[PDB]
Design a protein around this nucleic acid. Structure first.
Ligand SMILES: Nc1ncnc2c1ncn2[C@@H]1O[C@H](COP(=O)(O)OP(=O)(O)NP(=O)(O)O)[C@@H](O)[C@H]1O
Ligand SMILES: Nc1ncnc2c1ncn2[C@@H]1O[C@H](COP(=O)(O)OP(=O)(O)NP(=O)(O)O)[C@@H](O)[C@H]1O
Lengths: 267, 661, 663
DNA sequence: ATGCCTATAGGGCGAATTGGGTACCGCTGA
DNA sequence: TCAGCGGTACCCAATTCGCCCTATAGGCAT
């Protein structure tokens, strides 16, 4: 839990695991003086709150290590209970859970030096959300900084228009060049988008993201498979731009499944 | 089946003022029809059997075809006597509690009618017990008490932060900020016009982001056109106008794809003045200086002769360099430098040691401490061609610049329409962005007065509050036409009341409302009350409010004793449930009023449930069917900082008082 | 005897912020010393056994000679954590009820101290329940709530109508209106300076009439001096300055006869600067145009070379007239007229019928619809000498005008002192006018806190009303240190409260006070409560914590609460507190008749009420303060007088006797 | 070692923003 | 009437504050 974006990552995930379709992720002073995650997920009882801190792994990994203010109201008729620092008294909050947490950094001087300025650190927080956003197209995420609402990733209906939010995450540049992919061989199902290598510019080359059953894994296997496909359509071998989604039944065959899916879409 | 009705009318330089009286019933009323046809329709409507007019009435044509006419003096229609006489007639110290105090044009008619009534009748007329103003514009009738309380444009302090403006005012251009502000002080109630906006706002929800940067380029075109009409426009104003003209091809393309006939209409009203674009592009430099006084405004290529007189002033530096060089060679003085001076003009300066080694051609202009400056015929000749060419090129610049007013003013009207349309687009697209951003719904209008909110929220409070707004449901109708909202401080008494008031107003600017779902009925008058006077405003609401009016009574009961404010609140609630049947909201601390839902038909008990745990407290902020459980100032007192020892003395004195009841 | 004290300090670009804590008592204080020596004196005064500082503290010289020093990180002194931590410590939703909310510089120290206190002690600290701002300067303590409520300078709307300003602001010049507004913002409490003004105002009461017309000639000299320093001053600004300079001989004569050493001191600070008068009199025309841009500013006789370049432009109309005449004679064309054009220059226009009957000397410049305009060498030569001489004379006018800044700026300081003194004279003479007109009295200051008013009145309400204010007296002291003011609505109990507040403030600008006779004691903090609970109770708590034995407390309707059992019970404890513990000067305007049992309960408290006579539905308010309590409710009687329908009033009286039948 | 990545801090540029300048607005004895 | 005539509101426009960005080094697993 060393980077401020790490705290986010865990906590934003903690909402998704509670079955959340709305995430209010809020920050101030580039994540140094506010880290707030509010959801419309499932609430947590006054009982389970206490010893979760004193998901229960991550909550405790930050709770007594920060000024953590964990409040929630169970969907079942109750009164929103609220913790601090190890003290439960009731607040009033909607169905779900909220962690208006201040900087983990408290008794660690060296961890302040570890802080890589800020603005850059909320730009890293943005990337966490930006990634998580593409993983879950069913969850709404409104990202804010300094009280200023920054980015607005609104939940698309099941098999709806994905491009707006996609374009919100990846800017207008990619959205224009976005060529959709739909490959399927047995248990393996590949979906997503690719920018046309003909009109691929330096700005688009910043986007290289690959999601496998929700979780993103930065694996070099996929880099070969993609830069094999980007080479064997047109001669030029520049930096690609893509966002792709593979669903598999819970390696080298998968590599070949990927490559074949791309080249057919581009032409 | 007609009655004997009496009336009076008077006018100033501004408009007209009107008043009436039926001697059978005792109904006395007031109005200020601004135009003629409205005034003619008002006489035609009431149809008085006896009609007053002041000897010097200008627009006589109205009354010369009416019956039972009465020529009256002027002094009778004077506001001083009118106010004084009518105050003592009703027995008040002011006519603020009739909502006519700041309608002096109409009070001249009312004042003259009563002085005539007191002279026509000359008996006791207690039937005349009240008057009321009826600015029944499609615009909603709102006392300034509402605008200062709702904080539409101004908070309690006097700033424009934590307003409905501040929130909705993410408008890119100032003329958008102002049309937004005017809409909020003049809510449209023409259900057709409101639906025109709601269909517009729904279609631009998707395209909101792309249009907004294009609108930020325009600037305040509306106030630039006002200076253009005055013939006082500045170059930097015309630069903004050109920058705006370039965006019209772009906006005509983006809005062409959008599916909304109102949008396609506004797109045509926007029009295109690409002819005026061409003129200003050719005429003016990309970014000229502040004033026309300084010149350097009109670009080269527009006027041949501008460039001619410029070419004289441009052949300057090379003429002086070759002089400076030749005269440095010829004399043998290397400190010789030819430069300009605003005061004296051009000159030839030589160092004091080399000064008197200069030739006989040189005439002394300026003696310095360190040098001797001179002037020669060739310079003094070249001095003339510059100084005059500057002025004549600059004079041509002033004349051309005013001539551009004669080229633009033919479209002046069309540009105001375009500017209004562009300003309206910024508002609508801004609201389309706000409704997209803040997840607002389209409220649909019904026939009878009533607001049905589904998980609604305070459009301002939710935005600035760190925590989420606890959404509140509402069901107002002529069946449920009043809600006794008893509760704690930080209960949400004031919030749920004022949240309802904004929802109505926001719904009546055709803008998407802060709620999951709203269905709302006719609300003509929005009347509001808050502590600074008190009784003055409440009475106005009593007299003015109708079956359709929205009443927002806040803590009536800040009184002389427990009894005078409970008794009045109980009577006012009865009145608005028994007689008037207005859509009424009566947030209050009087739990004794919670005996009215059993007393009255139409009144309903609601409360903002608060659950106290430990020493501290939680406020659910959710409206529940019932009443307040206990007092909450004790719980709040600590939360306002107060030492716990007088909270202790409060709880120690509480149980001495609570032991009785 | 000797204490164990803990403290912390931090600074921004603006000034310093400070905080302390004694673990024996549980006192927790705050301050914002603006300058260095004040900050050094504050450390020297408190003398903490343990002292905090942020790693990047700039002015280290303060703390390098102190004991038990502690180097702390920066982030600990951040306002975000400070506010959050301290809010949950006290349990409040804001620190407004400590009167420190808008002191963020000091809260950085307090925020860092508590985080450190919670860690140094880690023990029972409920003896810490509050923080308070002890201002480095205690000359006067005023809340924005007073300034907005009393309407000293600004009414509820935001304008300056029916304020204490509007009344006292009959000042002839705007710089007088502003110094009047600042004094009201900063009431002087230095007895000597207050008596300096009262002796000044007494002496000018008679001489006020003569001086006031002379002060109206000055205009806003203060803002003219601001532009003079910026080198952006305008001719009509310099015209006002000269018009002001001419009045200094006149004012030095009128004030010489007046018997007041403070006036004679102000008269010397007034100065004369009859040299700077001579300069501007010679330099500038009596009334020049708005801007310097188009010249016509500097008078002839000042600069000989200005007059030279003018003489070229002055030999203009007669040169063209004699041409126009000679050419009209020679040609025989009477429609021949020689005129100027900005675009083309000068010309000779002849009517179209006579146009082609002109001589061969004439060269065509401009063809018109109705005429033919021409140019000749004599004119085209004369055209040059004008156009250029205009610009150069005008250019010399810009330079000379900027040079006059070089001549005036040596006395810039002395003129600001003079302008401040002239502005002060307008204020003082204006107040001396008000005191003369309304027969205001000179209040004299005593040692212990207490206001003794004899037939005193609301200085503002009395002026606007169409009935003389029913002036009422007062008797405050640390013996009679609270008054329970019950009575009707429009009873005049908020008025008598607010009338007392202005009287104190007006007495503390050294101005003659709206009363027959006043003797007043030290009032350091003027605290007020403004109706409309989360607004109301926050301010009341601030006034509980902050108010001292000497502070003036002005409670209005403590009790606009969730019931008559919460509001009373609070108000009850508040009255006890300010009579039992604080024993402070309190005016408690309320409708809680149950609190009228406190004069028998408490020592220092006294029952008073506003007499009113009701006949039928109508009611008449005597507006006179009587020792006792309110008779009954009065809202019923008022309701009708505010317009409320008799259908409500009857239903009020019908519901009244259903409720009054119980009690 | 090392080599491609990666955050960084000063610098540059853009967006608010309030003082300064202007066009306007009564208006004030004369 | 009247001609300044000072005030006054208000629209700029350079200034101030915050946001971005690209050369400028480091950086850490390999
Ligand atoms: N529905 C709500 N959701 C969130 N916060 C709320 C809600 N209702 C009220 N509040 C908060 O409650 C506080 C003030 O409540 P409000 O209802 O205005 O006062 P009240 O209960 O009438 N007492 P008073 O302060 O005298 O007006 C503010 O902090 C509001 O943000
Ligand atoms: N001494 C007085 N002489 C004449 N009129 C007065 C006097 N005191 C108050 N008034 C008038 O009384 C009215 C309001 O008085 P005020 O003291 O505000 O009433 P209250 O009893 O305090 N109730 P509230 O209006 O709620 O503050 C105004 O019209 C004042 O001008």
């Amino acid at each position: 839990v060393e980077r401020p974006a790490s705290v986010v990552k865990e906590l934003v995930e903690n909402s998704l695991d509670a079955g959340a379709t709305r995430i209010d992720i809020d920050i101030e002073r580039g994540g140094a003086k506010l880290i707030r995650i509010r959801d419309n997920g499932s609430g947590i009882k006054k009982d389970e709150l206490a010893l979760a801190l004193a998901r229960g792994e991550a909550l405790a990994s930050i709770s007594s290590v920060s000024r953590l203010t964990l409040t929630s109201r169970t969907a079942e008729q109750q009164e929103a209970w609220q913790a601090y620092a190890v003290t439960v008294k009731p607040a009033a909050h909607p169905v779900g859970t909220t962690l208006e947490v201040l900087d983990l950094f408290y008794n660690t001087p060296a961890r302040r030096k570890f802080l890589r300025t800020e603005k850059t650190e909320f730009n890293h927080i943005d990337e966490i959300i930006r990634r998580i956003a593409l993983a879950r197209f069913d969850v709404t995420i409104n990202l804010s900084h300094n009280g200023k609402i920054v980015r607005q990733y609104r939940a698309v209906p099941e098999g709806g228009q994905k491009e707006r939010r996609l374009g919100a995450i990846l800017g207008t540049a990619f959205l224009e060049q976005a060529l959709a992919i739909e490959w399927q061989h047995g248990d393996l199902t590949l979906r997503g988008w690719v920018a046309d290598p003909n009109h691929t510019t330096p700005a688009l080359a910043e986007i290289q993201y690959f999601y496998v059953n929700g979780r993103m894994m930065r694996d070099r296997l996929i880099n070969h498979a993609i830069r094999q496909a980007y080479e064997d359509k047109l001669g030029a071998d520049q930096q690609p731009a893509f966002v792709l989604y593979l669903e598999i039944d819970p390696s080298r065959l998968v590599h070949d499944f990927i490559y074949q899916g791309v080249l057919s879409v581009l032409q | 089946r007609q009655d004997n009705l009496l009336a009076a009318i008077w006018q100033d330089s501004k408009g007209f003022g009107y008043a009436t009286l039926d001697i059978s019933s005792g109904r006395f009323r007031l109005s200020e029809p601004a135009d003629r046809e409205t005034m003619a329709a008002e006489l035609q409507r009431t149809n008085p059997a006896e009609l007053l007019y002041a000897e010097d009435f200008a627009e006589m044509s109205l009354i010369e075809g009416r019956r039972g006419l009465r020529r009256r003096p002027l002094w009778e229609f004077e506001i001083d006597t009118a106010r004084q006489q009518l105050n003592l007639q009703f027995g008040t110290r002011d006519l603020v509690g009739f909502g006519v105090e700041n309608a002096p044009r109409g009070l001249s008619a009312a004042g003259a009618l009563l002085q005539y009534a007191k002279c026509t009748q000359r008996t006791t007329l207690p039937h005349i017990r009240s008057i009321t103003m009826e600015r029944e514009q499609d615009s909603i009738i709102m006392d300034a008490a509402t605008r200062r309380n709702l904080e539409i444009t101004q908070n309690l302090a006097g700033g424009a932060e934590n307003t409905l403006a501040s929130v909705l005012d993410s408008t890119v251009t100032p003329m958008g900020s102002r049309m937004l502000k005017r809409w909020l002080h003049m809510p449209v109630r023409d259900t057709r016009v409101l639906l025109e906006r709601q269909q517009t706002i729904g279609a631009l929800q998707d395209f909101t982001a792309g249009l907004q940067p294009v609108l930020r380029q325009v600037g305040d075109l509306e106030r630039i056109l006002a200076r253009l009409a005055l013939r006082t426009a500045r170059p930097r104003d015309l630069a903004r106008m050109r920058h705006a003209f370039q965006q019209l091809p772009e906006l005509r393309a983006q809005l062409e794809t959008v599916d909304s006939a109102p949008v396609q209409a506004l797109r045509e009203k926007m029009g295109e003045f690409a002819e005026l674009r061409d003129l200003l592009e050719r005429a003016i430099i990309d970014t000229p200086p502040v004033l026309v006084r300084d010149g350097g405004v009109i670009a080269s290529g527009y006027n041949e002769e501008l460039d001619e007189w410029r070419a004289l002033a441009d052949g300057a530096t090379d003429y002086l360099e070759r002089l400076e060089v030749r005269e440095r060679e010829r004399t043998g003085l290397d400190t010789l430098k030819v430069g300009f001076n605003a005061v004296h003009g051009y000159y030839i300066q030589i160092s004091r040691g080399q000064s008197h080694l200069a030739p006989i051609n040189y005439m002394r202009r300026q003696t310095l401490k360190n040098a001797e400056r001179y002037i020669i015929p060739e310079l003094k000749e070249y001095e003339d061609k510059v100084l005059t060419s500057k002025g004549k090129a600059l004079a041509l610049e002033k004349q051309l610049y005013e001539e551009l007013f004669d080229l633009l003013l033919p479209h002046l009207e069309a540009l105001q329409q375009s500017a209004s349309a562009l300003a309206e687009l910024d508002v609508l697209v801004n609201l389309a962005e706000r409704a997209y951003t803040l997840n607002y719904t389209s409220p649909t209008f019904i026939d009878k007065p009533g607001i049905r909110i589904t998980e609604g929220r305070h459009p301002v409070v939710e935005q600035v509050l760190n925590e989420p707004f606890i959404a509140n449901p509402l069901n107002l109708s002529p069946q449920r036409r009043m809600l006794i909202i008893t509760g704690p401080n930080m209960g949400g008494k004031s919030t749920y009341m004022r949240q309802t008031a904004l929802i109505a107003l926001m719904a009546y600017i055709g803008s998407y409302v802060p709620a999951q779902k709203v269905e709302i009925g006719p609300i003509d008058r929005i009347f509001t009350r808050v502590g600074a006077v008190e009784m003055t405003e409440t009475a106005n609401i009593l007299h003015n409010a109708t079956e359709y009016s929205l009443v927002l009574m806040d803590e009536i009961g800040r009184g002389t004793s427990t009894y005078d404010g409970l008794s009045l609140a109980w009577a006012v609630a009865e009145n608005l449930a028994n007689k008037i049947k207005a859509l009424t909201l009566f947030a209050t601390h009087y739990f004794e009023l919670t005996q009215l839902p059993e007393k009255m038909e139409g009144v309903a008990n609601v409360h903002l449930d608060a659950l106290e745990h430990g020493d501290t407290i939680a406020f659910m902020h959710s409206v529940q069917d019932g009443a307040a459980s206990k007092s909450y100032g004790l719980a709040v007192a600590a939360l306002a900082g107060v030492p716990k020892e007088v909270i202790k003395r409060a709880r120690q004195k509480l149980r001495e008082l609570e032991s009785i009841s």
